[PDB]
A paper describes a structure:
KHNYN is a ZAP-binding protein required for ZAP-restriction of CpG-rich viral genomes. It contains an extended diKH, PIN nuclease, and CUElike domain, each of which are required for ZAP restriction of viral replication. Our crystal structure reveals an extended PIN domain (ex-PIN) containing a conserved N-terminal arm region required for domain stability and an active site tetra-Asp motif, which are both required for antiviral activity. Unlike the weak activity recently reported for the PIN domain, we demonstrate that the KHNYN ex-PIN domain is a highly active Mn2+-dependent single-stranded RNA endonuclease that cleaves with a preference for ApC, ApA, and UpA dinucleotides.
Numbering used by the authors: 411 to 487, 490 to 511, 524 to 542, 551 to 594
The structure:
């Protein structure tokens, strides 16, 4: 029992260890909705920064080196669980503080651009075009193997620039 007690599924250990090796060259820039990811991991209740760290480790492990986690500036003050993961991401040039959806669309426009996330439809629509949904189990980050359905591409080719 206890919704809070169980969220200490955080006792299952996770360390952000990004292997110091160069990445593959034609992969797409991974744009991460830091808030969405952190809330999904925190069961829409906690800002669970480990959610972001886990998601970065996933793409870092596939060889992606152009990764940007957007998180609001005030999420550095703010009910944030394990904020130490944000500090580490910031200092490794993987995290930019928004001063909000427009920044991800802007960024993914400028780069090859994949958005990792679950009026003014112009901005809302652009997100649909590049959306990569996800789920967590615990520290396990899972993304669909056909990001856009069976008609659309495979995961491997969805994350390639060509």
């Amino acid at each position: 029992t206890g919704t809070q007690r169980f969220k200490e599924a955080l006792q299952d250990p996770f360390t952000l260890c990004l292997a110091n090796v160069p990445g593959q060259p034609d992969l797409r820039h991974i744009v991460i909705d830091g808030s969405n990811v952190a809330m999904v991991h925190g069961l829409q209740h906690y800002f669970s920064s480990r959610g972001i760290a886990i998601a970065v480790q996933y793409f870092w492990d596939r060889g992606h080196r152009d990764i940007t986690v957007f998180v609001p500036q005030w999420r550095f003050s703010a009910k944030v669980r394990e904020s130490h993961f944000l500090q580490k991401l910031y200092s490794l040039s993987l995290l930019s503080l928004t001063p909000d959806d427009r920044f991800m669309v802007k960024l993914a426009e400028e780069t090859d651009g994949i958005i990792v996330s679950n009026e003014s439809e112009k901005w809302m629509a652009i997100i649909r075009e590049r959306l990569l949904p996800f789920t967590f189990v615990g520290n396990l980050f899972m993304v669909p193997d056909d990001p856009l359905g069976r008609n659309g591409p495979t995961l491997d080719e969805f994350l390639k620039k060509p």
